[PDB]
Symmetry: D2
Subunit: 115 residues, 4 copies
């Protein structure tokens, strides 16, 4: 599984469950085309997402729908969403885990890249 | 000054100097239109990014060009760039703080009156 | 396994391997007594730090030896070490994961608590 | 001013006001002696914490009382407190800002170190 996410909620000290996650890929026309999608499970992870075959070289954007996550818990957050944009698989085959730590007015995102 | 940025480098423990920062604003055509731009100074701040008059209600995107920042220091980082998107319903002042590491990016919003 | 750690290196985008982790527990005499110790593996995890039986109610301190970690990579960091202090198991039995993200001049810590 | 703190609350997007802060310094006897203390103001800063004269070489610990901060806002937090320990002024005279970002189950800290030339 070459693209994973792990989302944690810094307010509750729990994985963030039901965070809608879209992955886009940049096209020759310089637009973002929807590549993959899911919802974080009980562990704040998205199983599947894509495959070594269908992945490939290019520029990807992983978007977490943070505003819906917070609003559903009665919190009024700052950000519309949290993006991670990066070039993938251009210097040999890697696996990417995108970790996101969520607070209402703050976010962090960290990439773990393996071989 | 109603929209500020403060950028820190977590590797050096110094403000991040010369980080290209673009601010966009969402339009009725559903596109991002360039609204403001600058480069962080010696304190990692951009000084007069916009003005109370020009900065109305709407949806804004602050973009930090992190890949250039790092590459120029001989580091090969993870992110192409780092976006902060939010709706200003202001009257309020917004500081976007970013902490930069090669494989991690952290952002906090400070909102005042 | 009721007390886990997960340590990531924000410079390399890799789990932080060989970080010395000591766990202390507060005593009646108001001192810290050494409770457990380990070194992060290839995934930045310590695997069996204590056990449900030995890990009771009280005040604990998890210490990461960050200065040795960085110096060994030729970096001269800011912090001597990074501590996480917390009360555990006082409102019923929980499992605790302490996540740390390391940069030379910055450290971040998050707790994940489950039932 | 050679030692500042700046404390932010990640839940509110506001400076964290009235965070109790203590600074300790390590002694020859291997113990922590209280060196300075304050409460964060409206900007989450404590300013005149110490002075270039009083603040020499050594090992210091800056402690934020996060549990009181949160409890006073009705939040039951995870950490008892948050410590930042570091050696200061051993390679020439510097100024230190310790920035802390607080969430109920998460704590983040960054050091900004400058050379007053
Ligand atoms: Zn593979
Ligand atoms: Zn876009
Ligand atoms: Zn158990
Ligand atoms: Zn101690
Ligand atoms: Zn001085």
């Amino acid at each position: 599984c070459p693209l994973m996410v792990k989302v944690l909620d810094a307010v509750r000290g729990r994985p963030a469950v039901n965070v809608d996650v879209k992955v886009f890929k940049k096209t020759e026309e310089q637009t973002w085309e929807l590549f993959a999608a899911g919802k974080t499970n009980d562990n704040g992870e998205i199983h599947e997402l894509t495959t070594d075959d269908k992945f490939g070289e290019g520029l990807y954007k992983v978007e977490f729908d943070t505003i819906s996550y917070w609003k559903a818990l009665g919190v009024s957050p700052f950000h519309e969403y949290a993006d991670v944009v990066f070039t993938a698989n251009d210097a040999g085959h890697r696996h990417y885990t995108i970790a996101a730590l969520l607070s209402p007015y703050s976010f962090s995102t960290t990439a773990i890249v393996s071989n």
